[PDB]
Amino acid sequence: MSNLSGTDKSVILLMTIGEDRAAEVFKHLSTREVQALSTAMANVRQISNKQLTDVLSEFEQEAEQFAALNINANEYLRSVLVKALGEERASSLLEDILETRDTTSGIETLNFMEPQSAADLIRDEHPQIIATILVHLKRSQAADILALFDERLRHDVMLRIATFGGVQLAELTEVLNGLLDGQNLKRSKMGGVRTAAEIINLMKTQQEEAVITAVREFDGELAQKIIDEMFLFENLVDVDDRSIQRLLQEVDSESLLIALKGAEPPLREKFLRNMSQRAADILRDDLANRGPVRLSQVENEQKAILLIVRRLAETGEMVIGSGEDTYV
Amino acid sequence: MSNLSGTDKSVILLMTIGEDRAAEVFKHLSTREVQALSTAMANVRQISNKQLTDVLSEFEQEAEQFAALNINANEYLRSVLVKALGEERASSLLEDILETRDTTSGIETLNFMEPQSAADLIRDEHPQIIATILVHLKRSQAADILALFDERLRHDVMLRIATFGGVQLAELTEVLNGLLDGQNLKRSKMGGVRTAAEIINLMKTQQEEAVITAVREFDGELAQKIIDEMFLFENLVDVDDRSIQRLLQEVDSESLLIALKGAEPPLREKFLRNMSQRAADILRDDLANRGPVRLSQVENEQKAILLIVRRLAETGEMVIGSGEDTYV
Amino acid sequence: RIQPYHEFARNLPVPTNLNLIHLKPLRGTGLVVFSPSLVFIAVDNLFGGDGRFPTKVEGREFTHTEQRVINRMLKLALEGYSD
Amino acid sequence: QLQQRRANQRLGAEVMSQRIREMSDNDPRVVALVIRQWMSNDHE
Amino acid sequence: QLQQRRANQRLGAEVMSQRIREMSDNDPRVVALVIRQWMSNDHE
């Protein structure tokens, strides 16, 4: 009795209703819904007898609440309106309603995802269309998009807004459709800055250092960007003290003791002031008593601490937002 | 009642369902699955009556949970979509889904095996394709692969990442397929470095010494690599003391006493400081009292100790990672 | 250019890729030669790059992926030749 | 007894397939909305 | 008695071969998934 998703239940219904049956079901379904459905059956698991019984019983209990004997809305409306108001009036008003729904759906869809994606999507566009698309979106998402352009382009766009003089609806719905098709690109960005920084972070010390030296020789600014994205392990010297204590609430004492053997003396001095007094005294005594440790073990402990920092930052507890910013 | 594997049960079902039946079963099976199946029956043991009864009862109890009346997913989806969205749309979207699954399966498969194998597989490739394949793999596996290339190639690859400008999906799925076919090479590497070192280790002392002298005459660097891989028996002088005590917790007293007769006096002095005080005194007294021992017996005991070290290192307790590295 | 075959071969930068074509009904063979520079640029643009980091040719034989890209551009060149 | 259990389960599945097919012939948009609601429930 | 035991075992084997053959004729993908699951169970 594996838990069955709505995709599984829908596939069970679809491959049982029929061929033209499933086709006419998709005739009343969005293109992306047809995509999600088609992605399912060609790698689905073959269903069970009791699984199909349960999913079709759920379909029955949903059909009890879903029974209307309905006819296709678009063609029904067209057939009624062609005689209610005439062919030309029916056509014009149906197209008006369709365009209104298109622009509303585009605005809603665009006010849903991460900012930089739409920012780079609209970066190449003409600044006037950028301006109108920006303002007709949600104000929060509009601000998120605006905070990512360059000085000249952003300034020109806002001047366009300040000197704005009205915009047509039909061409704007067409623009939303065009940018939707532009979103429909089977494309994977593969950002070679953040991923590169993470890879160099996962490197060992000698490897990452040689790699950093090579990239500094090739282009020093790119090396600086990579290191400003990755921070390595030594960035604990510039990590805030409260965050260090938050880490110390989870890090393990022997792992920290082993890691601190290879750490810089200034880093150790900064780190020992963060935990409790008795814990710091215990750590200092352990460092004094413990002899030399293998550099491989020290590197492994440091990498484990870095991974812990990374997951605690993913949780949002950590604040490593490109240094200690500005004190006010 | 020999325990019957899933391969055995699958063969039991397959050679009983039929010829075209088994063929149509493989039509819904991966190529490597067909390989594992075909490897079985041509050297399988003939089935028992109660064995086949039990495996087919297990098949029945699995079929109770597996009962769907399903139709082939790919052709069913094609036949539905050709009328749902049109022939061209159905073809294009089916190929998009197939390519997405191909690249996902390639990425998952490549993030599963030992690093150096994929490292040597991709060493000959162009550094740009190396870079893109590297970053689309798992970050841990990507780091493992990156830590094995040469300075120039690795530096160029990371420069490619730092200056990355985006990679197409379709040609990349094709590249994953091509490297999968490259993996499908019936080749046995058998490095003549590690195996050679182990063989020379298993040699007797005179044989291994003459062999080492010969390889040093031919190419001294290869001799140094072999000895740095094999360590012989005398490497206990450079073995860490904690590991020596761990070994002493398992080695046998009389075997150690016999072996130490032929050992170097510095090696004996280092070794006697590792065990307990009373054990060391007993060993010294036994060495003093015991007379000369046959060199063949001493060599046999030393080889047994070496084998014990090798198995305890295979278990991971022993740390012989190319010497005593760097003390920090 | 009109030149003897030996002069053309000497002027051709070794190493490089060469490919033979049969052109019915004329008896003979065409000798389309693709340079490491163009195959490099094509593979760099296809796999993602800027070309600011060119690599020399060290006599290594072209990879299978490089040969496949060569065939991809070769069929296009042949179709343009034919039309 | 297991064979009879499976047989009656299959017969019930077939008759319920009959009724779902006739109901969707009456209105396939009901099936479309059921699928859309299942898609909506999928993401939480 | 052993002969009759073997005879009835063989007859049961043949009839269950009949039912497995008809079930796999109904759906061979079930057999493919059973084989794949047996392969998955093999490696642990």
Side-chain angles (χ1 to χ4, degrees), chain B residues 97-166:
Chain B
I97 297 157
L98 279 159
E99 286 184 347
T100 301
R101 285 168 186 156
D102 287 339
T103 183
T104 51
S105 299
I107 286 180
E108 298 322 297
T109 316
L110 270 293
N111 297 320
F112 291 164
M113 82 305 297
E114 178 262 353
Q116 202 62 271
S117 305
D120 66 62
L121 177 56
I122 310 299
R123 262 171 197 163
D124 47 354
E125 280 292 334
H126 185 265
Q128 187 55 42
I129 194 58
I130 301 173
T132 184
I133 297 298
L134 180 66
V135 169
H136 291 171
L137 291 175
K138 174 58 61 196
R139 328 301 308 285
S140 55
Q141 292 301 108
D144 295 331
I145 306 296
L146 196 155
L148 312 169
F149 291 104
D150 67 85
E151 294 291 329
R152 306 313 305 124
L153 178 54
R154 168 207 321 120
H155 289 181
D156 208 0
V157 170
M158 62 79 69
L159 301 175
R160 293 164 199 277
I161 304 303
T163 48
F164 207 82

Coordinates of all heavy atoms in Angstrom, one line a residue, chain B residues 97-166:
Chain B
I97 N 10.7 14.7 -23.0 CA 10.7 13.9 -21.8 C 11.7 12.8 -21.8 O 12.4 12.5 -20.8 CB 9.3 13.3 -21.6 CG1 8.2 14.4 -21.4 CG2 9.2 12.4 -20.4 CD1 6.8 14.0 -21.8
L98 N 11.9 12.2 -22.9 CA 12.9 11.1 -23.0 C 14.3 11.7 -22.8 O 15.1 11.0 -22.1 CB 12.8 10.5 -24.4 CG 11.7 9.4 -24.6 CD1 11.4 9.2 -26.0 CD2 12.2 8.1 -23.9
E99 N 14.7 12.8 -23.3 CA 16.0 13.4 -23.1 C 16.2 13.8 -21.7 O 17.3 13.7 -21.1 CB 16.2 14.6 -24.0 CG 16.4 14.3 -25.5 CD 16.7 15.5 -26.4 OE1 16.5 16.6 -25.9 OE2 17.2 15.3 -27.5
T100 N 15.1 14.4 -21.0 CA 15.2 14.7 -19.6 C 15.5 13.5 -18.8 O 16.3 13.5 -17.9 CB 13.9 15.4 -19.2 OG1 13.7 16.6 -19.9 CG2 14.0 15.8 -17.7
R101 N 14.8 12.4 -19.0 CA 15.0 11.2 -18.3 C 16.4 10.6 -18.6 O 17.1 10.1 -17.7 CB 14.0 10.1 -18.6 CG 12.6 10.4 -18.0 CD 11.6 9.5 -18.6 NE 10.3 9.8 -18.1 CZ 9.2 9.5 -18.7 NH1 9.2 8.9 -19.9 NH2 8.0 9.7 -18.2
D102 N 16.9 10.7 -19.8 CA 18.2 10.2 -20.2 C 19.3 11.0 -19.4 O 20.2 10.4 -18.8 CB 18.5 10.4 -21.7 CG 17.7 9.4 -22.5 OD1 17.3 8.3 -21.9 OD2 17.5 9.6 -23.7
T103 N 19.2 12.3 -19.3 CA 20.2 13.1 -18.6 C 20.1 12.9 -17.1 O 21.1 12.8 -16.4 CB 20.1 14.6 -19.0 OG1 21.2 15.3 -18.3 CG2 18.8 15.2 -18.6
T104 N 18.9 12.7 -16.6 CA 18.8 12.5 -15.1 C 19.4 11.1 -14.8 O 20.1 11.0 -13.8 CB 17.3 12.5 -14.7 OG1 16.5 11.7 -15.6 CG2 16.8 14.0 -14.7
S105 N 19.1 10.1 -15.6 CA 19.6 8.7 -15.4 C 21.1 8.7 -15.5 O 21.8 8.1 -14.7 CB 19.0 7.7 -16.3 OG 17.6 7.7 -16.1
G106 N 21.6 9.5 -16.5 CA 23.1 9.5 -16.6 C 23.7 10.2 -15.4 O 24.8 9.7 -14.9
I107 N 23.2 11.3 -14.9 CA 23.7 12.0 -13.8 C 23.7 11.1 -12.6 O 24.7 11.0 -11.8 CB 23.0 13.3 -13.5 CG1 23.4 14.4 -14.6 CG2 23.3 13.9 -12.1 CD1 22.7 15.7 -14.4
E108 N 22.6 10.5 -12.3 CA 22.5 9.6 -11.2 C 23.5 8.4 -11.3 O 24.2 8.1 -10.3 CB 21.0 9.0 -11.0 CG 20.0 10.1 -10.8 CD 20.5 11.2 -9.9 OE1 20.8 11.0 -8.7 OE2 20.6 12.4 -10.4
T109 N 23.5 7.8 -12.4 CA 24.5 6.6 -12.6 C 25.9 7.1 -12.4 O 26.7 6.4 -11.7 CB 24.3 6.0 -14.0 OG1 22.9 5.9 -14.3 CG2 24.9 4.6 -14.0
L110 N 26.3 8.2 -12.9 CA 27.6 8.7 -12.8 C 27.9 9.1 -11.4 O 29.1 9.1 -11.0 CB 27.9 9.9 -13.7 CG 28.4 9.5 -15.1 CD1 29.8 9.0 -15.0 CD2 27.5 8.6 -15.9
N111 N 26.9 9.5 -10.6 CA 27.2 9.8 -9.2 C 27.1 8.6 -8.2 O 26.6 8.7 -7.1 CB 26.3 10.9 -8.7 CG 26.5 12.2 -9.5 OD1 27.7 12.6 -9.8 ND2 25.4 12.9 -9.8
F112 N 27.6 7.5 -8.7 CA 27.5 6.2 -7.9 C 28.8 5.4 -7.7 O 28.9 4.7 -6.8 CB 26.5 5.3 -8.6 CG 25.0 5.7 -8.5 CD1 24.1 5.1 -9.3 CD2 24.6 6.7 -7.6 CE1 22.7 5.5 -9.2 CE2 23.3 7.1 -7.5 CZ 22.4 6.5 -8.3
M113 N 29.8 5.6 -8.6 CA 30.9 4.7 -8.6 C 32.2 5.3 -8.0 O 32.2 6.5 -7.6 CB 31.2 4.0 -9.9 CG 32.0 4.9 -10.9 SD 31.3 6.5 -11.2 CE 29.8 6.1 -11.9
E114 N 33.3 4.6 -8.0 CA 34.5 5.0 -7.5 C 35.1 6.2 -8.4 O 34.9 6.1 -9.6 CB 35.5 3.9 -7.5 CG 36.9 4.2 -7.0 CD 37.9 4.3 -8.2 OE1 37.5 4.1 -9.3 OE2 39.1 4.7 -7.9
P115 N 35.7 7.2 -7.8 CA 36.1 8.4 -8.6 C 37.1 8.1 -9.7 O 36.8 8.6 -10.8 CB 36.7 9.3 -7.5 CG 36.1 8.8 -6.2 CD 36.0 7.4 -6.4
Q116 N 38.2 7.4 -9.5 CA 39.2 7.4 -10.4 C 38.8 6.7 -11.8 O 39.3 7.1 -12.8 CB 40.4 6.6 -9.9 CG 41.8 6.9 -10.6 CD 42.2 8.4 -10.4 OE1 41.8 9.2 -11.3 NE2 42.9 8.7 -9.4
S117 N 37.8 5.9 -11.7 CA 37.3 5.2 -12.9 C 36.7 6.3 -13.9 O 37.1 6.4 -15.0 CB 36.2 4.2 -12.6 OG 36.8 3.2 -11.7
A118 N 35.8 7.1 -13.4 CA 35.2 8.2 -14.2 C 36.3 9.2 -14.5 O 36.2 9.9 -15.6 CB 34.0 8.8 -13.5
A119 N 37.3 9.4 -13.6 CA 38.3 10.4 -13.9 C 39.1 10.0 -15.1 O 39.4 10.8 -16.0 CB 39.2 10.5 -12.6
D120 N 39.5 8.7 -15.2 CA 40.3 8.3 -16.3 C 39.4 8.2 -17.6 O 39.8 8.3 -18.7 CB 41.0 6.9 -16.1 CG 40.0 5.8 -15.8 OD1 39.2 5.5 -16.7 OD2 40.0 5.2 -14.7
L121 N 38.1 7.9 -17.3 CA 37.1 7.9 -18.5 C 37.0 9.3 -19.1 O 36.9 9.4 -20.4 CB 35.8 7.4 -18.0 CG 34.6 7.4 -19.0 CD1 35.0 6.6 -20.2 CD2 33.3 6.9 -18.4
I122 N 37.1 10.3 -18.3 CA 36.9 11.7 -18.9 C 38.2 12.4 -19.0 O 38.2 13.6 -19.5 CB 35.9 12.5 -17.9 CG1 34.6 11.6 -17.7 CG2 35.4 13.8 -18.6 CD1 33.9 11.3 -18.9
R123 N 39.3 11.8 -18.7 CA 40.6 12.5 -18.8 C 40.9 12.8 -20.3 O 41.3 13.9 -20.6 CB 41.7 11.6 -18.3 CG 42.2 11.9 -16.9 CD 43.1 10.8 -16.4 NE 43.3 10.9 -14.9 CZ 43.8 9.9 -14.2 NH1 44.2 8.8 -14.7 NH2 43.9 10.1 -12.9
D124 N 40.6 11.9 -21.2 CA 40.9 12.2 -22.6 C 39.9 13.1 -23.3 O 40.2 13.6 -24.4 CB 40.8 10.8 -23.4 CG 39.6 10.0 -23.1 OD1 38.9 10.4 -22.1 OD2 39.4 9.0 -23.7
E125 N 38.8 13.5 -22.6 CA 37.7 14.3 -23.2 C 38.2 15.8 -23.3 O 39.2 16.1 -22.7 CB 36.5 14.2 -22.4 CG 35.6 13.0 -22.7 CD 35.0 13.0 -24.1 OE1 34.8 14.1 -24.6 OE2 34.7 11.9 -24.6
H126 N 37.5 16.5 -24.1 CA 37.8 18.0 -24.2 C 37.5 18.7 -22.9 O 36.5 18.4 -22.3 CB 37.0 18.6 -25.3 CG 37.4 20.0 -25.6 ND1 36.6 21.1 -25.0 CD2 38.3 20.6 -26.3 CE1 37.2 22.2 -25.4 NE2 38.2 21.9 -26.2
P127 N 38.3 19.6 -22.4 CA 38.1 20.2 -21.1 C 36.8 20.9 -20.9 O 36.3 20.9 -19.8 CB 39.3 21.1 -21.0 CG 40.4 20.6 -21.9 CD 39.6 20.0 -23.0
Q128 N 36.2 21.4 -22.0 CA 34.9 22.1 -21.8 C 33.8 21.1 -21.5 O 33.0 21.3 -20.6 CB 34.6 22.8 -23.1 CG 33.3 23.7 -23.0 CD 33.4 24.7 -21.9 OE1 34.4 25.3 -21.6 NE2 32.3 24.8 -21.2
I129 N 33.7 19.9 -22.2 CA 32.8 18.9 -21.9 C 33.1 18.3 -20.5 O 32.2 18.0 -19.8 CB 32.7 17.8 -23.0 CG1 31.5 17.0 -22.9 CG2 33.9 17.0 -23.0 CD1 30.2 17.7 -22.9
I130 N 34.4 18.2 -20.2 CA 34.7 17.8 -18.8 C 34.1 18.7 -17.8 O 33.5 18.3 -16.8 CB 36.3 17.7 -18.7 CG1 36.9 16.8 -19.7 CG2 36.6 17.3 -17.3 CD1 38.4 16.8 -19.7
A131 N 34.2 20.0 -18.0 CA 33.7 21.0 -17.1 C 32.2 20.9 -16.9 O 31.7 20.9 -15.8 CB 34.1 22.4 -17.5
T132 N 31.5 20.8 -18.0 CA 30.0 20.8 -17.9 C 29.6 19.5 -17.3 O 28.7 19.5 -16.4 CB 29.4 21.0 -19.3 OG1 28.0 21.1 -19.1 CG2 29.7 20.0 -20.3
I133 N 30.2 18.3 -17.7 CA 29.8 17.1 -17.1 C 30.1 17.1 -15.6 O 29.4 16.5 -14.8 CB 30.5 15.9 -17.8 CG1 30.0 15.9 -19.3 CG2 30.2 14.6 -17.2 CD1 28.5 15.6 -19.4
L134 N 31.3 17.7 -15.2 CA 31.7 17.7 -13.8 C 30.7 18.5 -13.0 O 30.3 18.0 -11.9 CB 33.1 18.4 -13.7 CG 33.7 18.5 -12.4 CD1 34.0 17.2 -11.8 CD2 35.0 19.4 -12.5
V135 N 30.3 19.6 -13.4 CA 29.4 20.5 -12.6 C 28.0 19.9 -12.5 O 27.3 20.0 -11.5 CB 29.5 21.9 -13.0 CG1 28.4 22.8 -12.3 CG2 30.8 22.5 -12.6
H136 N 27.5 19.3 -13.6 CA 26.2 18.7 -13.5 C 26.2 17.4 -12.7 O 25.1 16.8 -12.5 CB 25.5 18.4 -14.8 CG 25.1 19.7 -15.6 ND1 24.7 19.7 -16.9 CD2 25.1 21.0 -15.2 CE1 24.4 20.9 -17.2 NE2 24.6 21.7 -16.2
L137 N 27.3 16.9 -12.2 CA 27.3 15.8 -11.3 C 27.1 16.2 -9.9 O 27.1 17.4 -9.5 CB 28.6 14.9 -11.5 CG 28.6 14.2 -12.9 CD1 29.9 13.5 -13.1 CD2 27.4 13.3 -13.0
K138 N 27.0 15.2 -9.0 CA 26.9 15.5 -7.5 C 28.1 16.2 -7.0 O 29.3 15.9 -7.5 CB 26.6 14.3 -6.7 CG 26.6 14.4 -5.2 CD 25.6 15.5 -4.8 CE 24.2 15.0 -5.2 NZ 23.2 16.1 -5.1
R139 N 28.0 17.2 -6.1 CA 29.1 18.0 -5.7 C 30.2 17.2 -5.1 O 31.4 17.5 -5.3 CB 28.6 19.1 -4.8 CG 27.2 19.6 -5.0 CD 27.0 20.2 -6.4 NE 28.0 21.2 -6.8 CZ 28.0 22.4 -6.3 NH1 27.1 22.9 -5.5 NH2 29.0 23.3 -6.8
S140 N 29.8 16.2 -4.3 CA 30.8 15.3 -3.7 C 31.5 14.5 -4.7 O 32.8 14.5 -4.7 CB 30.1 14.4 -2.7 OG 29.1 13.7 -3.3
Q141 N 30.8 13.9 -5.7 CA 31.4 13.2 -6.7 C 32.2 14.1 -7.7 O 33.3 13.7 -8.2 CB 30.4 12.4 -7.5 CG 29.8 11.2 -6.8 CD 30.8 10.2 -6.3 OE1 31.1 10.1 -5.1 NE2 31.4 9.5 -7.2
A142 N 31.7 15.3 -7.9 CA 32.5 16.3 -8.7 C 33.8 16.6 -8.0 O 34.8 16.7 -8.7 CB 31.6 17.5 -8.9
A143 N 33.8 16.8 -6.7 CA 35.0 17.1 -6.0 C 36.0 15.9 -6.1 O 37.2 16.0 -6.3 CB 34.8 17.4 -4.5
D144 N 35.4 14.6 -6.0 CA 36.3 13.4 -6.1 C 36.9 13.3 -7.4 O 38.1 13.0 -7.5 CB 35.4 12.2 -5.8 CG 34.9 12.2 -4.3 OD1 35.6 12.7 -3.5 OD2 33.8 11.6 -4.1
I145 N 36.2 13.6 -8.5 CA 36.7 13.6 -9.8 C 37.8 14.7 -10.0 O 38.8 14.5 -10.6 CB 35.6 13.7 -10.9 CG1 34.6 12.6 -10.7 CG2 36.2 13.6 -12.3 CD1 35.1 11.2 -10.9
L146 N 37.5 15.9 -9.5 CA 38.4 17.0 -9.7 C 39.7 16.8 -9.0 O 40.7 17.3 -9.5 CB 37.7 18.3 -9.3 CG 38.3 19.7 -9.8 CD1 37.2 20.7 -9.8 CD2 39.4 20.1 -8.9
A147 N 39.7 16.2 -7.9 CA 40.9 16.0 -7.1 C 41.9 15.0 -7.8 O 42.9 14.6 -7.1 CB 40.6 15.5 -5.7
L148 N 41.6 14.5 -9.0 CA 42.5 13.5 -9.6 C 43.1 13.9 -10.9 O 44.0 13.2 -11.4 CB 41.7 12.2 -9.9 CG 40.8 11.7 -8.7 CD1 39.9 10.6 -9.0 CD2 41.8 11.3 -7.5
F149 N 42.7 15.0 -11.5 CA 43.3 15.5 -12.8 C 44.6 16.2 -12.5 O 45.0 16.4 -11.4 CB 42.3 16.5 -13.5 CG 41.1 15.8 -14.0 CD1 39.9 16.0 -13.4 CD2 41.1 15.0 -15.2 CE1 38.7 15.4 -13.9 CE2 40.0 14.4 -15.7 CZ 38.8 14.6 -15.0
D150 N 45.3 16.5 -13.6 CA 46.6 17.1 -13.5 C 46.4 18.6 -13.3 O 45.3 19.2 -13.4 CB 47.4 16.9 -14.8 CG 46.8 17.5 -16.0 OD1 47.1 18.7 -16.3 OD2 46.1 16.8 -16.7
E151 N 47.5 19.3 -13.0 CA 47.4 20.8 -12.7 C 46.8 21.6 -13.9 O 45.8 22.3 -13.7 CB 48.8 21.3 -12.3 CG 49.4 20.7 -11.1 CD 48.7 21.2 -9.8 OE1 48.1 22.3 -9.8 OE2 48.6 20.4 -8.8
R152 N 47.4 21.4 -15.1 CA 46.9 22.2 -16.2 C 45.5 21.9 -16.6 O 44.7 22.9 -16.8 CB 47.9 22.0 -17.4 CG 49.3 22.2 -17.1 CD 49.6 23.5 -16.3 NE 49.0 24.6 -17.0 CZ 48.2 25.5 -16.5 NH1 47.7 25.4 -15.2 NH2 47.7 26.5 -17.2
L153 N 45.1 20.7 -16.7 CA 43.8 20.3 -17.1 C 42.8 20.7 -16.1 O 41.7 21.3 -16.4 CB 43.7 18.8 -17.3 CG 42.3 18.3 -17.7 CD1 41.8 19.0 -18.9 CD2 42.4 16.8 -18.0
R154 N 43.0 20.5 -14.8 CA 42.1 20.9 -13.7 C 42.0 22.4 -13.7 O 40.8 23.0 -13.5 CB 42.6 20.4 -12.4 CG 41.9 21.0 -11.2 CD 42.8 20.9 -10.0 NE 43.6 19.7 -9.9 CZ 44.9 19.6 -9.9 NH1 45.6 20.7 -10.0 NH2 45.5 18.5 -9.9
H155 N 43.1 23.2 -13.8 CA 43.0 24.6 -13.8 C 42.2 25.1 -15.0 O 41.4 26.0 -14.8 CB 44.4 25.2 -13.8 CG 45.2 25.0 -12.6 ND1 46.5 25.4 -12.4 CD2 44.8 24.4 -11.4 CE1 46.9 25.1 -11.1 NE2 45.9 24.5 -10.5
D156 N 42.4 24.6 -16.2 CA 41.6 25.0 -17.3 C 40.1 24.7 -17.1 O 39.3 25.5 -17.5 CB 42.2 24.3 -18.6 CG 41.9 25.1 -19.8 OD1 41.3 26.2 -19.7 OD2 42.3 24.6 -20.9
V157 N 39.8 23.5 -16.6 CA 38.4 23.2 -16.4 C 37.8 24.2 -15.4 O 36.6 24.6 -15.6 CB 38.3 21.7 -15.8 CG1 36.9 21.4 -15.4 CG2 38.7 20.8 -16.9
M158 N 38.5 24.5 -14.3 CA 37.8 25.5 -13.4 C 37.7 26.9 -14.0 O 36.8 27.6 -13.7 CB 38.5 25.5 -12.0 CG 39.9 26.0 -12.0 SD 39.9 27.8 -12.1 CE 39.3 28.3 -10.5
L159 N 38.7 27.2 -14.8 CA 38.5 28.5 -15.5 C 37.3 28.5 -16.5 O 36.6 29.5 -16.6 CB 39.8 28.8 -16.3 CG 41.1 29.0 -15.6 CD1 42.3 29.2 -16.5 CD2 41.0 30.1 -14.6
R160 N 37.1 27.4 -17.1 CA 35.9 27.2 -17.9 C 34.6 27.4 -17.1 O 33.7 28.0 -17.5 CB 35.9 25.8 -18.6 CG 37.0 25.7 -19.7 CD 37.2 24.3 -20.0 NE 38.5 24.1 -20.7 CZ 38.8 24.4 -22.0 NH1 37.9 24.8 -22.8 NH2 40.0 24.2 -22.4
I161 N 34.6 26.8 -15.9 CA 33.5 27.0 -15.0 C 33.3 28.4 -14.6 O 32.2 29.0 -14.7 CB 33.6 26.1 -13.8 CG1 33.7 24.6 -14.2 CG2 32.3 26.2 -12.9 CD1 32.6 24.2 -15.1
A162 N 34.4 29.1 -14.2 CA 34.4 30.5 -13.7 C 34.0 31.4 -14.9 O 33.5 32.5 -14.6 CB 35.7 30.9 -13.2
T163 N 34.2 31.0 -16.1 CA 33.8 31.8 -17.3 C 32.7 31.1 -18.1 O 32.5 31.3 -19.3 CB 35.0 32.0 -18.2 OG1 35.7 30.8 -18.4 CG2 35.9 33.0 -17.6
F164 N 31.9 30.3 -17.4 CA 30.8 29.5 -18.0 C 29.7 30.4 -18.5 O 29.4 31.4 -17.9 CB 30.2 28.5 -17.0 CG 29.6 27.3 -17.6 CD1 30.4 26.2 -18.0 CD2 28.3 27.2 -17.9 CE1 29.9 25.1 -18.6 CE2 27.7 26.1 -18.5 CZ 28.5 25.0 -18.8
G165 N 29.2 30.1 -19.7 CA 28.2 30.9 -20.4 C 27.0 30.1 -20.8 O 26.2 30.5 -21.6
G166 N 26.8 28.9 -20.2 CA 25.6 28.1 -20.4 C 25.8 27.0 -21.4 O 26.4 27.1 -22.4

